[PDB]
Amino acid sequence: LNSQDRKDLDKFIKFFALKTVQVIVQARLGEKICTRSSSSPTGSDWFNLAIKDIPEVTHEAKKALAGQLPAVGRSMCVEISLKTSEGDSMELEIWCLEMNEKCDKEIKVSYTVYNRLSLLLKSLLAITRVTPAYRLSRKQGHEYVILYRIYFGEVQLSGLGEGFQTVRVGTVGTPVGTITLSCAYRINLA
Amino acid sequence: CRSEVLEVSVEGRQVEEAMLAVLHTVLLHRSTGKFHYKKEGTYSIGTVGTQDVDCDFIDFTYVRVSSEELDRALRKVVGEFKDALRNSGGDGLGQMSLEFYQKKKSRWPFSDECIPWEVWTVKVHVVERQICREKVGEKLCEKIINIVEVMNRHEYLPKMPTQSEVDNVFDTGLRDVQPYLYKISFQITD
Amino acid sequence: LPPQVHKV
């Protein structure tokens, strides 16, 4: 429960949440994402991953968080929806970044929490390409588009249809709680 | 040393793309930025970029690290796998395996000991073509989800090395990405 | 800004 470890864990978590939004939204824009690797330490690439930030998304993500971090009862959710040219909307995905009360006492925030979050981000990248909404998002732009919303609070799972699936992207244990990242997605594309 | 087994049934034209999807997803998790050491136990990390890859023979996209050197290498062994399959002329039974290992340094005249800590094994059954393009894509979606779930079980990772140990943990020969030491081989069981 | 260096 050390102080310098607390300020660093909060910064790690905050930036992990911000990058989680960016990864999810960029996976639903309709374009392939191809970023560059560099041997040289850029000094500003969070979790050592080449994630170019979209400013609008960063602003929208900060407004939902409002200077707060995930905690028990306060989860960050990215909602992904389909909107037709005629105005119909169908919910596709709910990504939830949660933190629970379960603590990991012997875990080093200095680099072990950092590197596990970096791994979780990488799992997020892979998973966003293989859920049913990815193909829909790549084909978007004419009869429909893909919209997104960022809630911060209680997780509500309505709107995905009976029989929706949930995939756990992964978990990171920390001295103040365990981060869990998952996706609940609709399979009845009606 | 933990071992993970994947099985997949594909058409002959789909063998190469299905193996790269799996190997690249695994390696996406099992690599980091290139280390640049300042002191013995002090270093900084480069940045990993990623690429989306649409398959030509499977209706499927996967994320890979953006490194032509690493992609060319995986293509080489997978192509030999396919040559052995096409030359086998059996029922279409074969497998590739990817093993991550550390090195213990040895004294003259012996070679360093290679201690594997993770092996991934992918079994293939080669087996109208229209419905297969989608069924294999859905199956591949399962494998990547499966791979991610194994990843975050957090079974064991090598201790992060000092400058003197860095070549017993990581493959530092690539220009832009730094994978854990690994070996790929294959077998034909037709 | 992220951690600039990692100590082992």
Short mmCIF file of C-alpha atoms in Angstrom, two decimals:
data_model
loop_
_atom_site.label_atom_id
_atom_site.label_comp_id
_atom_site.label_asym_id
_atom_site.label_seq_id
_atom_site.Cartn_x
_atom_site.Cartn_y
_atom_site.Cartn_z
CA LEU A 1 0.00 0.00 0.00
CA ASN A 2 2.95 2.29 -0.74
CA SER A 3 2.50 5.84 -2.02
CA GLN A 4 4.77 6.05 -5.07
CA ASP A 5 3.38 2.65 -6.10
CA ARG A 6 -0.16 4.03 -5.76
CA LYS A 7 0.41 7.05 -8.01
CA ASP A 8 2.07 4.80 -10.60
CA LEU A 9 -0.68 2.18 -10.51
CA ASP A 10 -3.35 4.85 -11.02
CA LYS A 11 -1.44 6.23 -14.01
CA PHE A 12 -1.01 2.70 -15.41
CA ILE A 13 -4.72 1.95 -15.02
CA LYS A 14 -5.90 5.29 -16.40
CA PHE A 15 -3.75 4.98 -19.51
CA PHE A 16 -4.68 1.31 -19.88
CA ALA A 17 -8.35 2.33 -19.95
CA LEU A 18 -7.70 5.12 -22.47
CA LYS A 19 -5.78 2.74 -24.74
CA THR A 20 -8.51 0.10 -24.38
CA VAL A 21 -11.06 2.54 -25.82
CA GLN A 22 -8.74 3.49 -28.69
CA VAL A 23 -8.10 -0.17 -29.59
CA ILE A 24 -11.81 -1.06 -29.57
CA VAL A 25 -12.96 1.99 -31.53
CA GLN A 26 -10.15 1.64 -34.08
CA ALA A 27 -11.19 -1.99 -34.59
CA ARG A 28 -14.64 -0.77 -35.71
CA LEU A 29 -13.77 2.08 -38.11
CA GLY A 30 -13.93 -0.04 -41.27
CA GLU A 31 -10.22 0.26 -42.16
CA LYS A 32 -7.24 -2.02 -41.67
CA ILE A 33 -4.85 -0.74 -39.01
CA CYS A 34 -1.14 -1.05 -39.82
CA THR A 35 1.26 0.64 -37.39
CA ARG A 36 5.05 0.74 -37.40
CA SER A 37 7.52 -1.05 -35.16
CA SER A 38 10.61 0.85 -34.02
CA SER A 39 13.71 -0.47 -32.26
CA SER A 40 14.39 2.92 -30.69
CA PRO A 41 12.53 3.61 -27.41
CA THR A 42 10.07 6.32 -28.43
CA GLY A 43 9.55 7.32 -24.78
CA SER A 44 5.83 8.04 -25.27
CA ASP A 45 4.34 4.75 -26.54
CA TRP A 46 2.29 3.46 -23.61
CA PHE A 47 2.78 -0.27 -22.92
CA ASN A 48 5.33 -0.37 -25.78
CA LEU A 49 2.57 -0.71 -28.41
CA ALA A 50 2.12 1.52 -31.47
CA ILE A 51 -1.39 2.88 -30.79
CA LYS A 52 -2.02 6.21 -32.52
CA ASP A 53 -4.61 8.11 -30.49
CA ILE A 54 -7.68 9.59 -32.19
CA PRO A 55 -8.22 12.92 -30.37
CA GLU A 56 -12.04 12.81 -30.46
CA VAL A 57 -11.95 9.33 -28.89
CA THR A 58 -9.54 10.46 -26.18
CA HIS A 59 -11.82 13.39 -25.36
CA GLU A 60 -14.93 11.20 -25.36
CA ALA A 61 -13.11 8.67 -23.15
CA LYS A 62 -12.00 11.29 -20.62
CA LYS A 63 -15.49 12.81 -20.41
CA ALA A 64 -16.94 9.41 -19.50
CA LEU A 65 -14.26 8.72 -16.88
CA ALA A 66 -14.26 12.24 -15.38
CA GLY A 67 -10.98 11.92 -13.51
CA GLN A 68 -11.95 8.51 -12.10
CA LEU A 69 -10.72 4.95 -12.41
CA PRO A 70 -12.56 1.63 -12.58
CA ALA A 71 -13.48 0.12 -9.23
CA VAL A 72 -16.11 -2.11 -7.65
CA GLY A 73 -19.41 -0.86 -9.07
CA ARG A 74 -17.72 1.62 -11.44
CA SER A 75 -16.88 -0.17 -14.69
CA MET A 76 -15.98 1.39 -18.04
CA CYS A 77 -18.06 0.09 -20.94
CA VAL A 78 -17.62 0.62 -24.67
CA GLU A 79 -20.91 -0.07 -26.45
CA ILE A 80 -20.74 -0.87 -30.18
CA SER A 81 -23.88 -0.52 -32.30
CA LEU A 82 -25.05 -0.81 -35.89
CA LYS A 83 -27.15 2.02 -37.35
CA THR A 84 -28.88 1.62 -40.70
CA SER A 85 -29.51 4.38 -43.22
CA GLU A 86 -33.21 4.12 -42.31
CA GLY A 87 -32.54 4.81 -38.63
CA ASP A 88 -32.73 1.29 -37.21
CA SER A 89 -30.17 0.46 -34.54
CA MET A 90 -28.95 -2.92 -33.30
CA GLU A 91 -26.54 -3.34 -30.40
CA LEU A 92 -23.55 -5.52 -31.27
CA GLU A 93 -21.03 -5.50 -28.42
CA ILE A 94 -20.46 -4.39 -24.83
CA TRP A 95 -16.79 -4.27 -23.81
CA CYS A 96 -16.38 -3.98 -20.02
CA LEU A 97 -13.24 -2.94 -18.14
CA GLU A 98 -13.94 -3.85 -14.51
CA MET A 99 -11.97 -3.96 -11.29
CA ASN A 100 -12.97 -6.14 -8.34
CA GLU A 101 -12.15 -6.15 -4.63
CA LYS A 102 -9.73 -9.10 -4.89
CA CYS A 103 -6.17 -7.93 -4.20
CA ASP A 104 -2.83 -9.45 -5.16
CA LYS A 105 -0.50 -8.68 -2.25
CA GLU A 106 2.77 -9.93 -3.78
CA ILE A 107 2.74 -8.29 -7.22
CA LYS A 108 5.11 -5.54 -8.37
CA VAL A 109 3.35 -2.55 -9.90
CA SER A 110 6.82 -1.45 -11.01
CA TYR A 111 6.84 -3.43 -14.30
CA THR A 112 4.90 -6.61 -13.52
CA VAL A 113 1.50 -4.89 -13.50
CA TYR A 114 2.72 -2.72 -16.38
CA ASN A 115 3.84 -5.66 -18.54
CA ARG A 116 0.69 -7.68 -17.85
CA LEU A 117 -1.49 -4.75 -18.90
CA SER A 118 0.62 -4.48 -22.06
CA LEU A 119 -0.09 -8.18 -22.66
CA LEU A 120 -3.81 -7.65 -22.02
CA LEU A 121 -3.84 -4.83 -24.60
CA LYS A 122 -2.31 -7.27 -27.09
CA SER A 123 -5.01 -9.85 -26.34
CA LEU A 124 -7.54 -7.07 -26.90
CA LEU A 125 -6.11 -6.36 -30.37
CA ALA A 126 -6.36 -10.01 -31.42
CA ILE A 127 -9.86 -10.49 -29.99
CA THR A 128 -11.33 -7.38 -31.63
CA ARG A 129 -10.59 -8.90 -35.04
CA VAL A 130 -12.38 -12.23 -34.45
CA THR A 131 -15.71 -11.23 -32.88
CA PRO A 132 -18.75 -11.11 -35.21
CA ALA A 133 -18.88 -7.30 -35.29
CA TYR A 134 -15.46 -7.00 -36.97
CA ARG A 135 -16.64 -8.20 -40.38
CA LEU A 136 -19.72 -5.97 -40.10
CA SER A 137 -17.50 -3.00 -39.29
CA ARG A 138 -15.20 -3.64 -42.25
CA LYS A 139 -18.22 -3.72 -44.59
CA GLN A 140 -19.76 -0.55 -43.15
CA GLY A 141 -20.33 2.84 -44.72
CA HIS A 142 -23.26 2.54 -47.17
CA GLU A 143 -26.38 0.75 -45.89
CA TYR A 144 -25.27 1.17 -42.26
CA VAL A 145 -22.48 2.43 -40.01
CA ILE A 146 -21.00 1.43 -36.66
CA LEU A 147 -21.49 3.81 -33.72
CA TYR A 148 -19.88 3.69 -30.27
CA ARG A 149 -20.76 4.91 -26.76
CA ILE A 150 -18.67 4.99 -23.57
CA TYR A 151 -20.57 4.52 -20.31
CA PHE A 152 -18.96 4.68 -16.88
CA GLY A 153 -20.86 3.05 -14.04
CA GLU A 154 -22.97 -0.05 -13.54
CA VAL A 155 -22.62 -2.62 -16.31
CA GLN A 156 -25.90 -3.09 -18.18
CA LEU A 157 -26.09 -5.94 -20.69
CA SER A 158 -29.50 -5.39 -22.27
CA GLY A 159 -29.82 -5.21 -26.04
CA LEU A 160 -27.53 -7.99 -27.29
CA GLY A 161 -30.33 -10.50 -27.78
CA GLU A 162 -31.04 -13.85 -26.21
CA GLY A 163 -28.07 -16.18 -26.45
CA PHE A 164 -25.35 -13.53 -26.48
CA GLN A 165 -21.81 -14.77 -25.82
CA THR A 166 -19.23 -13.40 -23.41
CA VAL A 167 -15.48 -13.79 -23.93
CA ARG A 168 -12.97 -12.91 -21.22
CA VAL A 169 -10.05 -11.07 -22.77
CA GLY A 170 -7.99 -11.46 -19.60
CA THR A 171 -7.28 -10.32 -16.07
CA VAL A 172 -4.52 -8.44 -14.27
CA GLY A 173 -4.06 -8.70 -10.51
CA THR A 174 -2.94 -5.61 -8.60
CA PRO A 175 -2.45 -4.66 -4.94
CA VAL A 176 -5.79 -2.77 -4.98
CA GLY A 177 -7.86 -5.12 -7.12
CA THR A 178 -8.02 -7.38 -10.13
CA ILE A 179 -8.65 -5.79 -13.53
CA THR A 180 -10.92 -7.85 -15.79
CA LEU A 181 -11.54 -7.12 -19.48
CA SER A 182 -14.28 -8.91 -21.38
CA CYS A 183 -16.65 -8.64 -24.32
CA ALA A 184 -20.31 -9.59 -24.46
CA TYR A 185 -21.46 -9.75 -28.06
CA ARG A 186 -24.65 -10.49 -29.98
CA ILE A 187 -24.79 -13.59 -32.19
CA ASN A 188 -28.36 -13.11 -33.45
CA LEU A 189 -27.65 -10.58 -36.20
CA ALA A 190 -31.38 -10.51 -37.16
CA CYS B 1 6.83 -27.30 -19.27
CA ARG B 2 3.31 -26.49 -20.47
CA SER B 3 2.03 -27.54 -23.89
CA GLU B 4 -1.05 -26.38 -25.78
CA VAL B 5 -2.71 -28.31 -28.60
CA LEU B 6 -4.85 -26.83 -31.39
CA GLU B 7 -6.63 -28.87 -34.04
CA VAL B 8 -8.13 -27.58 -37.29
CA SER B 9 -9.65 -29.05 -40.44
CA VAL B 10 -8.94 -27.02 -43.59
CA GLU B 11 -8.77 -27.38 -47.35
CA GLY B 12 -5.31 -27.71 -48.87
CA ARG B 13 -5.41 -24.14 -50.15
CA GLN B 14 -6.10 -22.98 -46.58
CA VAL B 15 -3.21 -24.72 -44.81
CA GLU B 16 -0.65 -21.91 -45.12
CA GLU B 17 -2.99 -19.10 -44.01
CA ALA B 18 -4.37 -21.07 -41.06
CA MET B 19 -0.89 -21.80 -39.68
CA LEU B 20 0.29 -18.19 -39.98
CA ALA B 21 -2.85 -16.92 -38.24
CA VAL B 22 -2.08 -19.14 -35.25
CA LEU B 23 1.70 -18.65 -35.14
CA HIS B 24 1.38 -14.87 -35.52
CA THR B 25 -1.24 -14.56 -32.79
CA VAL B 26 0.92 -16.55 -30.38
CA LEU B 27 4.03 -14.58 -31.30
CA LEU B 28 2.05 -11.34 -30.93
CA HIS B 29 1.80 -12.22 -27.22
CA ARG B 30 5.29 -13.72 -26.93
CA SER B 31 7.39 -10.76 -28.07
CA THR B 32 8.32 -7.29 -26.88
CA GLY B 33 10.11 -4.18 -28.03
CA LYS B 34 13.81 -4.42 -28.69
CA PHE B 35 15.81 -3.95 -25.49
CA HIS B 36 18.51 -1.26 -25.39
CA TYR B 37 20.57 -1.60 -22.23
CA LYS B 38 21.97 1.42 -20.38
CA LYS B 39 23.38 -0.29 -17.27
CA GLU B 40 23.65 -4.00 -16.48
CA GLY B 41 20.08 -4.27 -15.21
CA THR B 42 18.73 -1.02 -16.67
CA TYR B 43 17.26 -0.87 -20.17
CA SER B 44 14.54 0.73 -22.28
CA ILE B 45 12.08 -0.82 -24.70
CA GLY B 46 11.20 -0.07 -28.31
CA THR B 47 7.67 -0.12 -29.70
CA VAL B 48 5.76 -3.00 -31.32
CA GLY B 49 3.48 -2.19 -34.24
CA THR B 50 0.77 -4.41 -35.68
CA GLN B 51 -0.79 -5.32 -39.02
CA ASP B 52 -4.20 -6.66 -39.96
CA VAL B 53 -4.02 -9.55 -42.41
CA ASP B 54 -7.04 -10.51 -44.51
CA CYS B 55 -6.72 -14.10 -45.71
CA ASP B 56 -7.25 -14.84 -49.40
CA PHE B 57 -8.54 -18.41 -48.93
CA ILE B 58 -10.25 -18.05 -45.54
CA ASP B 59 -12.84 -15.39 -44.70
CA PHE B 60 -10.80 -14.19 -41.77
CA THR B 61 -8.52 -11.44 -40.44
CA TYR B 62 -5.82 -11.66 -37.77
CA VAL B 63 -3.38 -9.26 -36.14
CA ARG B 64 0.37 -9.81 -36.45
CA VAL B 65 3.44 -7.92 -35.34
CA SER B 66 4.62 -5.61 -38.10
CA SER B 67 7.94 -7.26 -38.99
CA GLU B 68 8.73 -8.53 -42.48
CA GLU B 69 11.72 -10.43 -41.05
CA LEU B 70 9.52 -12.38 -38.64
CA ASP B 71 6.75 -12.93 -41.19
CA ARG B 72 9.18 -14.15 -43.86
CA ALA B 73 10.62 -16.65 -41.37
CA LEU B 74 7.22 -18.12 -40.44
CA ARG B 75 6.28 -18.35 -44.12
CA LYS B 76 9.44 -20.36 -44.78
CA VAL B 77 8.73 -23.16 -42.31
CA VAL B 78 4.98 -23.22 -43.06
CA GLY B 79 5.81 -23.62 -46.75
CA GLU B 80 8.03 -26.59 -45.96
CA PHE B 81 5.15 -28.01 -43.92
CA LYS B 82 2.93 -27.68 -46.99
CA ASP B 83 5.58 -29.22 -49.26
CA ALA B 84 5.81 -32.20 -46.92
CA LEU B 85 2.01 -32.49 -46.85
CA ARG B 86 1.68 -32.30 -50.64
CA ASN B 87 4.50 -34.86 -50.97
CA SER B 88 3.06 -37.12 -48.26
CA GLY B 89 -0.09 -37.88 -50.25
CA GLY B 90 -1.75 -39.42 -47.20
CA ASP B 91 -5.00 -38.69 -45.41
CA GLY B 92 -3.75 -35.14 -44.78
CA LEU B 93 -2.53 -35.57 -41.20
CA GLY B 94 0.30 -33.37 -39.92
CA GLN B 95 1.29 -30.90 -37.25
CA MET B 96 3.44 -27.86 -36.51
CA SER B 97 4.79 -26.95 -33.10
CA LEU B 98 6.23 -23.72 -31.69
CA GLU B 99 8.42 -23.92 -28.59
CA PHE B 100 9.71 -21.08 -26.42
CA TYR B 101 12.84 -21.82 -24.41
CA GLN B 102 15.48 -20.25 -22.19
CA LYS B 103 19.20 -21.02 -22.29
CA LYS B 104 21.46 -22.09 -19.44
CA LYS B 105 25.08 -21.28 -20.27
CA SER B 106 27.45 -24.25 -20.52
CA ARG B 107 31.20 -24.56 -20.16
CA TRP B 108 33.42 -25.69 -23.02
CA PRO B 109 33.03 -28.03 -24.81
CA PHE B 110 29.25 -28.42 -24.44
CA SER B 111 26.47 -26.26 -25.88
CA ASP B 112 24.11 -24.20 -23.75
CA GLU B 113 21.18 -26.17 -22.39
CA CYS B 114 17.87 -25.23 -24.00
CA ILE B 115 15.02 -25.38 -21.47
CA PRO B 116 11.57 -25.05 -23.08
CA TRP B 117 8.87 -23.38 -21.03
CA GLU B 118 6.01 -23.34 -23.56
CA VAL B 119 5.25 -25.37 -26.68
CA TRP B 120 2.27 -24.74 -28.96
CA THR B 121 1.23 -27.65 -31.19
CA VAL B 122 -1.15 -27.24 -34.14
CA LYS B 123 -2.57 -30.38 -35.74
CA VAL B 124 -3.98 -30.23 -39.28
CA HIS B 125 -6.38 -32.45 -41.19
CA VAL B 126 -6.50 -31.60 -44.91
CA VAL B 127 -9.85 -32.41 -46.53
CA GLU B 128 -18.14 -26.87 -51.46
CA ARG B 129 -15.10 -24.60 -51.35
CA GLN B 130 -17.52 -21.71 -50.79
CA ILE B 131 -18.97 -22.94 -47.48
CA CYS B 132 -15.49 -23.96 -46.32
CA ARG B 133 -14.24 -20.38 -46.69
CA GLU B 134 -16.67 -19.35 -43.93
CA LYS B 135 -16.67 -22.45 -41.71
CA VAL B 136 -12.87 -22.37 -41.41
CA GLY B 137 -13.03 -18.66 -40.65
CA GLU B 138 -15.45 -19.30 -37.79
CA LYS B 139 -13.27 -22.15 -36.49
CA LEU B 140 -10.18 -19.93 -36.70
CA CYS B 141 -12.12 -17.34 -34.68
CA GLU B 142 -12.46 -20.02 -32.00
CA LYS B 143 -8.73 -20.84 -31.98
CA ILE B 144 -7.64 -17.23 -31.55
CA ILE B 145 -10.15 -16.85 -28.72
CA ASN B 146 -8.76 -20.09 -27.27
CA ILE B 147 -5.18 -18.86 -27.67
CA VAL B 148 -5.97 -15.59 -25.88
CA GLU B 149 -7.58 -17.47 -23.00
CA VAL B 150 -4.47 -19.64 -22.54
CA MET B 151 -2.25 -16.54 -22.71
CA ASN B 152 -3.76 -14.76 -19.71
CA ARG B 153 -3.74 -17.82 -17.44
CA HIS B 154 -0.30 -16.32 -16.61
CA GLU B 155 1.32 -19.72 -16.13
CA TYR B 156 4.98 -18.59 -16.15
CA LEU B 157 7.23 -16.13 -17.94
CA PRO B 158 11.04 -16.04 -17.79
CA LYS B 159 12.57 -13.53 -15.40
CA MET B 160 13.40 -10.31 -17.22
CA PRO B 161 17.13 -10.44 -17.95
CA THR B 162 20.14 -8.28 -17.32
CA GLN B 163 22.27 -7.33 -20.31
CA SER B 164 24.35 -10.48 -19.78
CA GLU B 165 21.29 -12.78 -19.80
CA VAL B 166 19.32 -11.12 -22.60
CA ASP B 167 20.38 -13.65 -25.25
CA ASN B 168 19.34 -16.62 -23.09
CA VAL B 169 15.75 -15.30 -22.98
CA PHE B 170 15.10 -13.33 -26.16
CA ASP B 171 15.79 -13.58 -29.88
CA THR B 172 17.71 -10.31 -30.34
CA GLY B 173 18.56 -10.88 -34.02
CA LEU B 174 15.47 -9.30 -35.61
CA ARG B 175 15.57 -5.67 -36.69
CA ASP B 176 12.35 -4.32 -35.12
CA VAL B 177 10.69 -6.87 -32.76
CA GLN B 178 12.11 -8.98 -29.91
CA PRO B 179 10.54 -12.44 -29.56
CA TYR B 180 11.18 -14.97 -26.85
CA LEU B 181 13.62 -17.60 -28.11
CA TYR B 182 11.60 -20.06 -30.14
CA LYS B 183 11.85 -23.03 -32.48
CA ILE B 184 9.29 -24.24 -35.04
CA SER B 185 9.26 -27.78 -36.42
CA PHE B 186 6.68 -30.04 -38.03
CA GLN B 187 5.68 -33.68 -38.48
CA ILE B 188 3.62 -35.60 -41.04
CA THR B 189 1.37 -38.23 -39.47
CA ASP B 190 -0.62 -39.31 -42.55
CA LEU C 1 4.34 9.78 -19.89
CA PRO C 2 5.08 6.05 -19.66
CA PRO C 3 7.96 4.57 -17.67
CA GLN C 4 11.08 5.59 -19.54
CA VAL C 5 13.38 2.80 -18.30
CA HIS C 6 13.00 -0.66 -16.77
CA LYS C 7 15.30 -1.85 -13.97
CA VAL C 8 16.17 -5.51 -13.40
#
